[PDB]
Design a binder for this molecule. Structure first.
Ligand SMILES: Nc1ncnc2c1ncn2[C@@H]1O[C@H](COP(=O)(O)OP(=O)(O)OP(=O)(O)O)[C@@H](O)[C@H]1O
Ligand SMILES: Nc1ncnc2c1ncn2[C@@H]1O[C@H](COP(=O)(O)OP(=O)(O)O)[C@@H](O)[C@H]1O
Ligand SMILES: Nc1ncnc2c1ncn2[C@@H]1O[C@H](COP(=O)(O)OP(=O)(O)O)[C@@H](O)[C@H]1O
Lengths: 50, 149, 902, 292, 417, 149
């Protein structure tokens, strides 16, 4: 979580490149800082039932 | 109607929970007693006394596609009023189907395509190409025991 | 040999059970899993290597028996839960994983892991985590685990702080990840030793190590540890095996009767902090029962006679351990449960008649009450005998009971009786924590010098250890007369337990000799870690243990002796008259019981009103003696003295029992006395008895006869002007004169501006040899203020026979008027330092100097304080242990008549 | 700004006596907080443009305060490290033989530091620590020497701990007592309970030169088949390794003998209680239960 | 019963165990045997080490053992083998024949898209209760996504009126202490009276502060904050409560419990030692239900001279209210069977949940220390609808048609509320 | 307050408190104000705000000062000697004799009583007023409360 906070506060610095995307595989737990959660786009993946 | 839907059905009362229909149980009867206080029906015991077909509707596999007009008020020609009354009635009888009926109340209020996108698996090739700024990190949360990489 | 036989019995019972139950179920193949699932040993005496001779297998995992010399470690009963725990742990080890049993505390997770480690012969280390965890040591301890080949363990890992938890989790994740590589199919042969990063270096990881984490786990370890649920041990089987190992016959019946009994004592009995009915207590009870049975066998054989009633032995062992811890109201509950599970067996008790005679002889000279059975004092003597029994077992017994229960006198009498009987001298050091800083209790190192300055406890312990005068000819009893909390008791842990050694921050070890007991005299027991209360036995005192009749008997006995010749004669003639009122019925005790249902500020205590009554009765005795000395001819007549005392007693009981309540309760108590008394009373329509005084020659003179209507001079109408006389003023004058003649501490509780300070000062003009020192207590007030006051006014520290603190002026008594004495802030442990300080130096008449660690005695110091009603915001109630000595006075606002007169 | 001048002529170094007949400085709060407050005050005064009354009165003392800080922040560290190293080097009378070069280096450092201590104690004054020529540079030299010798001590401790890794369990001062106080064995036995499981003592010879066996805390004993000789194995870690190896081999041999004896009990329809009791009394508890 | 974690690590461990044991047994590279597979080793290792490690309660272990025993026998190698005995009663799931993974994968991909809880062995109506819970949760979320002195005052006064007045904490005696039932009921009444007094005082303070008559304190402030959010105050829960309960439900339950305790106190006042046994108490309205069982056992052992540990429980579901009440029989009401129905004393599987048991009778018979016939089942008696606290276990006979394993894997139980 | 203090001939004293104030800084300020009040016979209107309060030690010192004059333990040995020097200088300035330490101290206390006035300025009543009364009751007994609406 601390290094993730460091990453998210670093991300506020502008990255001029347009095709650069940063995908972060994630676990659904409250220990993640809320700052990154609010800053970046969120997707949720679930195991289909059956 | 919404106030009764959210919390108005959780009120407390003294008596009146007598069973009338052998197919209608005590919890359903007590829910009827709650729903009776809403003037949008003004009577429910009398309606279920007649129309024995209601009992069959009480055991249907999907008893939300077709629902009898137990409310006896001014005609809800607008589909929204009919949908919300039927949704409250479904909350009364067979609450398990509620969610399914919930979908209907959304659909008739937003078209029969509103939630169809979520049913189809997503394709990120359009989401990350345009809708995602290069400064925004795309987080992919995964339920424990599953990987989205 | 006894422990060896116990281990063999424990092993052979399990061997027999496995052989007859799980092998005789129609099994004939040596490769069947019903046999392959057990713990098999294979010995090859031809293998040259020491670590290749004994191979131990559980299901399919092979372990080489590390030939560590474990000494004699207690074994564990192989319950089916223990069997499945062993199987799961070995399966985790074979897969190069770690075992993580969990469940409620007390099911034996750490013990099971340690027993498994010992079974394979592996030096195992358990880390208690919790509070005593050494975060610094882990960096080298993990390397030691990796290189030595030890086992390692953890205890309540979730009880560790989050940051240390994360750091240790990262370290153990690295270690376990390195351990996972020994089972790589491509890396099956270890050409290059496996290395791990612990201290920024490559550390070789021995394959024989492990890590176990017992919880009550972080996402890092979720993929590396095999969990295991240990929620309930098989108590019945453990009890049966332990009783069988002790020689008990019909052990299964005894276990089936005793396990539910302990499952009841935590359900029917009222829950208490010190109540422990876990498996550890059961094992202690069983070993005590075995010892008792062997003692019975030896006693019978000294007139293999194996026909003793074993249920009687079991209940005797249970009682001798559980009775002292009861709260004096669960005793009928405990005996009812015993009669329920054990149908028709009675608890017989030893007598110790020599100690009974010693206690009787000691109590006869201390003016105490002694009783052998159901008579008065029987329960107190039983508690003293229980204290003696606990003395010979542990070394850290802590007697507990509400203020007013006879526990201090109990151990004083026990010490005197043991000195008389054993012939060895007895010395007791009454150390009072929370009045001295912890830094000055154990000692401190100045970082700029590295000089070790020992504190009070370390000093006295070092004096005991050094045989300057005597280290074994006496019986040192370090008594901690003060409430406990986990700030200083944490350093005393290593002394209470079996270690019997105190470590010091300067790197020193002090082992106390086997003649010192660390006793505690507390009343709450509500602020203490379970480790402290579990490392030492205790006896529980109760309010009803000390009856009021014994209080009255002690007062009368100390009145007929101890002169306040002619003075003692007048005391005896008065005690004879007051005797028919202390008969456990009649006047005094009926009023005492009736006064406990009245609205009293600073809630009453039985030992406070009685102490006030005794003090004012002593004042009456010295007053009637003063009157006798006033008239040489015609001395004080007995007939008039009878009717003087009979009414002064009513005056004193009214002003002591209802002396801290509004006029309504005083009038109510007066009416109750009118209803129940038999002595003559003033004949008034509605005037309460509170408005009368028992004048010499025995008359109810109205207080209004001592209200001189005076005119004050014009220029002085201010506060420093003396009081204008009124009923309340001239009544509190006599009351405070009575309580200040005997040099007793006082408390005046009342609404602000009522006149407490003014009344006290006006009373202090009547006394011509009392100096006043006004201290203003407030929040963040600590006993250092009193020390500075003494340094300012009590320069004397002469040592004729010990350090004595005396005021500078000769022949004068100082009164330290501590205004707002209940205002000092109460810390998060429910106590006040200054209150405890002024309680110890009043009850014990002195304190300890923090500089030279010496017992300084008070000489001419007295305490008076002012207060406000405890319901007032910002005010906190005073401790009962302090309120017991100080009689409080409720000075309400003057009435309209009083205001008009003033 | 005058009050600074009147007050700075009054501070001594507030010296205390030492166990080895020395002098040490204890006052650090007054010699740090007051000095930093004064330097902040003089900076605020001089940077104020109205300095017509102190045109040249603050630059003359800001450098003095900076020198005070620069000397004292190293002086405190030198004092702490020197007293710690003195405690280390004047404990067990064997560190003079273990790393003697470090011993003589610390001897020279202590000689110079005691010369400085005598110099400051002879003329104690907060300015009389500035007139010493080269006091600062000698102070950093002493700090560097103390740091290097402490680092060498740490490296030696790590090297000693790497051999016989059981030393990883004990602390630093305990390890120092173990390695140093090794000529006589009467203080090692209080650390054996944290290096092994149940080994609370060692059965020394009459003249404590040969180790014959191991004793438990309660009193159980195991006697080595081949005693470990310290008179032929110095360098304590080596004969400790020999002791542990002999413990393993002796336990193995005793277990072999015990199981050979038990094989008689295993296949016997009857049994003599006295023989079983004698066998129980012969071997150790763990060996007995393992034999069974 | 608990939301365990059965992630991929357990599957990897099971695969490793299967590999190791199959390789050890089958040294021959080709077909070994349908019977020589170490079935016992695999069953025990799954049931005790890798899958049963996380199992806390005994009944979940029983369910896991039932699944492992049904699935991991040599009969699975037979051509005909029902993986699911009955889907829609007549609908069965056959074991796909094959010796290579491709045909098994093809079978998996050809599974019918219809899926019902009957595939899992659960009753076919479990989806109904699951959907009901999901709908209730959705309503709760929407409510959570939706001055107030007046709003709170009316409902606080309604709660004050609904809760009965202070109960008669006057159960005092001198020769009935020897009666365990009197002791248990006395402590129950004392606890109920204390909690009722505290709740009544707090609610009166809330009512008066909602009227703006007194300055709220920190304790009152946080109590009001709890009340307005619709969350049960922490300071009120002194007995076991379902995890998650609105204050309305807790208030109604507390009113019912206080009514029951008032009736008990009135009966004790009428009698004191003979009427406490004849009372018909419900186990759901008691703060410590298992203490009632213990007290009943104590009273039964006290009436005779038998030891407490020599008694065994026996359950009779008497029809309606026979009011037999033998010397050892005790009447408990409110118990509900889940997924099963009893005619006289024998169980039978049912498709309707929450069957009510009228006037359960608990007898303490001096056990003969014998093994019961293999035609009975052990049912748990939980306290809440969330089976997270065990009170005791009943022993019930079953109709000869069904088998105990069906009862075990179906999830039948006894609920006190 | 400042206006009336100047118009009464009282030198107004104030505490310029920042976030770095400690107990010792307040003790030094109190020493200065006591020296100005006792010695030199200068009347002082020591005015302070609730914003001029940061620690309970401030109110403890105020409780010790407002009641019974002098503050016990405020002066250390060196400070004791200094204060004795200034107070003996002031006593000989007035004309009183120098006899012993005790009577110089009592003259200093009397001068402080006669030549010092402490003014507190606070915001309207809240729980802060209750807390302030609890930590120090002197401002409810020694200090007269004048509401200023
Ligand atoms: N037989 C007796 N045994 C003990 N105390 C007795 C007896 N008869 C009278 N007393 C009186 O009872 C009191 C016992 O007080 P004790 O000092 O033992 O109490 P404590 O609880 O240890 O004290 P504290 O309340 O200060 O903590 C004394 O006043 C003593 O005189
Ligand atoms: N199988 C067993 N055989 C004998 N004693 C046991 C067994 N299991 C637990 N105990 C006893 O239980 C006591 C407490 O165990 P403990 O180590 O505190 O477990 P935990 O640390 O998990 O609470 C131990 O003193 C031990 O003697
Ligand atoms: N003769 C008297 N009797 C009773 N009260 C008086 C008398 N003379 C003065 N008082 C009042 O009693 C008060 C005592 O003040 P003080 O001692 O500070 O109150 P307390 O100490 O009770 O808080 C004075 O303010 C005065 O108004």
């Amino acid at each position: 979580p601390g290094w993730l906070m460091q990453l998210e506060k670093k991300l506020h610095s502008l990255q001029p490149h347009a095709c650069f995307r940063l995908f972060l595989t994630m676990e659904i737990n409250p220990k993640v800082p809320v700052n990154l959660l609010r800053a970046g786009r969120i997707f949720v993946f679930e195991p289909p039932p059956g | 109607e919404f106030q009764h839907f959210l919390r108005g059905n959780e009120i407390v009362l003294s008596a009146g929970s007598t069973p009338r229909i052998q197919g209608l149980t005590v919890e359903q009867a007590e829910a009827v007693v709650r729903l009776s206080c809403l003037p949008a029906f003004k009577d429910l015991i009398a309606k279920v006394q007649a129309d024995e077909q209601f009992g069959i509707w009480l055991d249907s596999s999907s008893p939300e596609q077709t629902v009898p007009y137990l409310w006896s008020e001014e005609t809800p020609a607008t589909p929204i009023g009919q949908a919300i009354h039927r949704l409250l009635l479904i909350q009364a009888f067979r609450p398990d189907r509620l969610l399914a009926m919930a979908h209907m109340f959304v659909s008739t209020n937003l078209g029969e395509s509103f939630m169809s996108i979520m049913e189809q698996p997503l394709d990120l090739t359009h989401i990350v190409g345009t809708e995602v700024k290069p400064n925004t990190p795309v987080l992919m949360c995964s339920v424990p025991g599953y990987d989205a990489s | 040999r006894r422990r060896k036989l116990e281990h063999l019995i424990t092993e052979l019972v399990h061997q027999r059970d496995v052989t007859r139950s799980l092998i005789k179920s129609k099994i004939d193949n040596a490769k069947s899993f019903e046999w392959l699932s057990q713990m098999r040993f294979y010995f090859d005496p031809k293998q040259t290597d020491v670590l290749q001779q004994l191979s131990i297998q559980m299901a399919n995992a092979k372990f080489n028996y590390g030939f560590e010399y474990l000494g004699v470690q207690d074994k564990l009963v192989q319950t089916p839960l223990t069997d499945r725990c062993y199987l799961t742990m070995t399966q985790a080890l074979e897969a190069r994983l770690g075992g993580s049993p969990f469940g409620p505390a007390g099911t034996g997770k750490t013990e099971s892991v340690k027993a498994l480690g010992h079974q394979l012969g592996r030096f195992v280390l358990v880390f208690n985590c919790d509070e005593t965890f050494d975060f610094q040591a882990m960096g080298r301890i993990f390397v030691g685990l990796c290189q030595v080949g030890a086992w390692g363990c953890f205890d309540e890992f979730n009880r560790l702080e989050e940051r240390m938890l994360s750091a240790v989790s990262q370290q153990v994740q690295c270690i376990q990840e390195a351990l996972r590589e020994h089972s790589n199919p491509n890396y099956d042969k270890t050409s290059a030793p496996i290395t791990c990063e612990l201290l920024n270096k490559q550390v070789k990881v021995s394959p024989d190590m492990a890590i176990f984490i017992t919880m009550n786990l972080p996402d890092n370890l979720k993929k590396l540890f095999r969990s295991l649920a240990m929620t309930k041990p098989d108590r019945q089987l453990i009890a049966q095996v332990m009783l069988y190992s002790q020689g008990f016959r019909t052990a299964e019946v005894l276990a089936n009767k005793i396990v539910p009994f302990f499952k009841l004592c935590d359900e029917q009995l009222s829950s208490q902090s010190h109540y422990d009915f876990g498996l550890r207590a059961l094992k202690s009870v069983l070993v005590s029962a075995g010892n008792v049975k062997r003692e019975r066998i030896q006693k019978i054989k000294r007139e293999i006679a194996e026909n003793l009633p074993e249920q009687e032995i079991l209940i005797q062992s249970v009682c001798e351990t559980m009775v002292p811890k009861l709260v004096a109201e669960d005793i009928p509950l405990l005996f009812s449960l015993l009669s329920d599970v054990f149908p028709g067996v009675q608890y017989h008790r030893g007598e110790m008649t020599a100690l009974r005679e010693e206690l009787k002889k000691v109590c006869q000279e201390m003016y105490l009450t002694y009783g052998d059975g159901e008579e008065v004092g029987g329960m107190w003597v039983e508690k003293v005998l229980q204290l003696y029994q606990i003395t010979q077992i542990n070394h850290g017994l802590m007697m507990v009971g509400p203020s007013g229960s006879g526990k201090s006198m109990a151990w004083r009498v026990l010490l005197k009786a043991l000195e008389r009987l054993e012939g060895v001298e007895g010395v007791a050091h009454i150390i009072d924590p929370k009045a001295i800083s912890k830094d000055h209790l154990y000692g401190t190192l100045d970082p700029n010098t590295r000089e070790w300055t020992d504190g009070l406890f370390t000093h006295v312990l070092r004096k005991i250890i050094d045989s300057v005068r005597g280290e074994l000819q006496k019986r040192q009893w370090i008594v901690f007369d003060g409430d406990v909390d986990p700030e200083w008791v944490e350093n005393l842990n290593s002394v209470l337990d079996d270690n019997k050694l105190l470590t010091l921050p300067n790197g020193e070890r002090l082992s106390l000799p086997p003649n010192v007991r660390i006793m505690f005299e507390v009343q709450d027991l509500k602020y203490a870690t379970l480790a402290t209360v579990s490392r030492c036995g205790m006896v529980w005192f109760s309010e009803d243990v000390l009856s009021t009749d014994m209080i009255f008997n002690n007062f009368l006995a100390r009145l007929r002796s101890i002169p306040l010749s002619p003075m003692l004669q007048i005391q005896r003639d008065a005690a004879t008259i007051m005797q028919p009122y202390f008969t456990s019925n009649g006047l005094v005790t009926k009023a005492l019981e009736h006064a406990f249902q009245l609205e009293h500020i600073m809630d009453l205590t039985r030992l406070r009103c009685l102490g006030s009554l005794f003090s004012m009765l002593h004042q009456a005795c010295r007053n009637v003696a003063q009157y006798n000395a006033n008239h040489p001819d015609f001395p004080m007549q007995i007939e008039q003295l009878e009717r003087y005392i009979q009414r002064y007693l009513v005056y004193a009981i009214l002003w002591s029992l209802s002396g801290d309540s509004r006029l309504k309760m005083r009038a109510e108590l007066g009416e109750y006395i009118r209803r129940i008394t038999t002595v003559p009373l003033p004949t008034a329509p509605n005037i309460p008895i509170i408005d009368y005084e028992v004048s010499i020659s025995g008359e109810w003179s109205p207080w209004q006869a001592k209200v001189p209507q005076i005119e004050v001079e014009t220029h002085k109408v201010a506060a420093p002007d003396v009081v204008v006389p009124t009923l309340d003023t001239v009544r509190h004058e006599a009351l405070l004169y009575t309580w200040l003649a005997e040099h007793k501490p006082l408390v005046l509780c009342g609404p602000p501006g009522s006149g407490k300070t003014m009344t006290l000062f006006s009373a202090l003009r009547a006394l011509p040899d009392m100096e006043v020192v006004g201290l203003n207590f407030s929040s963040a007030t600590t006993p250092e203020l009193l020390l500075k006051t003494f340094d300012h006014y009590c320069e004397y520290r002469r040592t004729p026979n010990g350090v004595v603190l005396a005021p500078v002026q000769l022949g004068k008594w100082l009164v330290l008027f501590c205004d707002e004495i209940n205002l000092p802030d109460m810390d998060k442990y429910g106590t006040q330092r200054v209150i405890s300080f002024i309680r110890q130096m009043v009850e014990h008449g002195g304190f300890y100097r923090t500089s030279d660690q010496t017992w300084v005695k008070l000489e001419r110091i007295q305490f008076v304080g002012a207060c406000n009603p405890p319901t007032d915001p910002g005010r906190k109630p005073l401790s009962h242990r302090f309120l017991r000595h100080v009689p409080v006075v409720y000075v309400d606002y003057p009435g309209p008549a009083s205001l008009t007169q003033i | 700004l005058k009050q600074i001048r009147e007050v700075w002529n009054t501070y001594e170094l507030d010296l205390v006596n030492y166990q080895n007949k020395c002098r040490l400085i204890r006052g650090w709060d007054d010699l740090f907080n007051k000095v930093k407050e004064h330097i902040n005050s003089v900076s605020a005064m001089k940077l104020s443009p109205y300095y017509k009354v102190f045109e040249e009165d603050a630059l003359s003392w800001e450098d003095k305060l900076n020198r005070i800080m620069a000397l004292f922040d190293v002086w405190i560290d030198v004092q702490r490290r020197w007293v710690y190293l003195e405690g280390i080097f004047t404990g067990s009378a064997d560190i003079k033989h273990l790393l003697p070069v470090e011993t003589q280096r610390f001897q020279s450092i202590s000689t110079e530091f005691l010369a400085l201590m005598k110099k400051v104690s002879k003329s104690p004054l907060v300015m009389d620590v500035l007139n010493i020529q080269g006091v600062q540079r000698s102070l950093e030299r002493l700090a560097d020497l103390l740091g290097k010798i402490q680092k060498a001590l740490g490296e030696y401790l790590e090297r000693e701990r790497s051999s016989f890794p059981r030393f990883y369990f004990v602390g630093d001062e305990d390890l120092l007592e173990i390695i140093g106080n090794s000529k006589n064995v009467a203080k090692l036995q209080k650390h054996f309970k944290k290096m092994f499981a149940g080994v609370s003592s060692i059965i020394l010879n009459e003249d404590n030169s040969v180790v014959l066996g191991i004793s438990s805390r309660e009193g159980e004993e195991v006697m080595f088949k081949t005693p470990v000789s310290i008179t032929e194995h110095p360098k304590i870690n080596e004969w400790l390794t020999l002791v542990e190896k002999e413990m393993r081999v002796t336990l193995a041999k005793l277990l072999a003998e015990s199981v050979t004896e038990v094989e008689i009990f295993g296949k016997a329809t009857s049994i003599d209680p006295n023989t079983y009791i004698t066998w129980i009394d012969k071997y150790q508890a763990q060996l007995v239960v393992l034999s069974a | 019963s608990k939301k365990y974690e059965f992630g991929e690590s357990d599957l990897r461990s099971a695969c490793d165990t299967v590999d190791t044991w199959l390789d050890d047994t089958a040294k021959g590279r080709q077909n070994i045997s349908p019977d020589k597979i170490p079935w016992s080793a695999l069953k025990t290792l799954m049931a005790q080490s890798i899958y049963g490690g996380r199992v806390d309660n005994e009944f979940d272990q029983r369910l896991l053992n039932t699944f492992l025993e049904r699935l991991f026998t040599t009969r699975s190698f037979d051509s005909e083998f029902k993986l699911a005995c009955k889907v829609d009663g007549h609908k069965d799931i056959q074991m796909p024949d094959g010796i290579r993974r491709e045909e098994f994968v093809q079978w998996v991909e050809l599974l019918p898209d219809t899926q019902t809880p009957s595939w899992l062995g659960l009753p076919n109506n479990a989806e109904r209760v699951l959907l009901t819970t999901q709908g209730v949760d959705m309503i709760s979320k929407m409510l959570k996504m939706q001055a107030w002195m007046r709003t709170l005052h009316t409902t606080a006064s309604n709660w004050l009126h609904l809760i009965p007045q202070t109960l008669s904490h006057l159960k005092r005696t001198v020769e009935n202490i020897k009666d365990p039932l009197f002791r248990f009921f006395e402590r129950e009444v004392k606890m109920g009276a204390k909690l009722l007094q505290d709740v009544r005082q707090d609610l009166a303070d809330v009512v008066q502060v909602c009227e703006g008559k007194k300055k709220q304190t920190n304790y009152l402030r946080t109590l009001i904050n709890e009340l307005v959010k619709g969350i049960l105050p922490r300071s009120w829960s002194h007995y076991t409560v379902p995890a998650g309960m609105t204050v309305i439900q807790w208030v109604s339950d507390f009113s019912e419990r206080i009514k029951q305790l008032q009736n008990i106190s009135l009966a004790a006042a009428s009698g004191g030692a003979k009427e406490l046994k004849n009372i018909h108490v419900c186990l759901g309205g008691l703060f410590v239900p298992e203490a009632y069982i213990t007290a009943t056992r104590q009273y039964v052992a006290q009436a005779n001279s038998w030891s407490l540990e020599e008694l065994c429980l026996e359950v009779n579901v008497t029809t309606s209210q026979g009011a037999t009440l033998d010397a050892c029989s005790f009447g408990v009401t409110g118990l509900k069977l889940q997924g099963a129905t009893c005619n006289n004393n024998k169980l039978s599987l049912s498709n309707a949940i929450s069957t009510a048991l009228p006037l359960t009778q608990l007898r303490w018979v001096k056990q003969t220390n014998t093994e019961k016939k293999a035609s009975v089942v052990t049912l748990p008696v939980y306290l809440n609808f969330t089976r997270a606290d065990l009170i005791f276990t009943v022993d019930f006979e079953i109709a000869t048609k069904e088998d105990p394993r069906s009862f075990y894997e179906r999830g039948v139980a006894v609920l006190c509320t | 307050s400042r206006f009336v203090a100047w118009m009464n001939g009282l030198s107004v004293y104030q505490i310029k408190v920042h976030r770095k104030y400690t107990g010792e800084d307040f003790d030094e300020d109190l020493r200065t104000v006591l020296r100005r009040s006792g010695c030199k016979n200068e009347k002082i209107a020591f005015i302070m705000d609730e914003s001029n309060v940061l620690d309970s030690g401030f109110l403890e010192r105020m409780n010790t000062l407002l009641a019974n004059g002098e503050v016990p333990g405020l002066f250390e040995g060196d400070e004791y000697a200094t204060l004795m020097t200034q107070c003996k200088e002031g006593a000989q300035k007035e004309g009183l004799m120098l006899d012993s330490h005790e009577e110089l101290y009592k003259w200093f206390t009397s001068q402080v009583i006669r030549n010092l006035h402490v003014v507190f300025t606070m915001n309207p009543s809240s729980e802060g007023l209750k807390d302030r009364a609890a930590t120090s009751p002197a401002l409810f007994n020694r200090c007269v409360l004048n509401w200023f609406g």
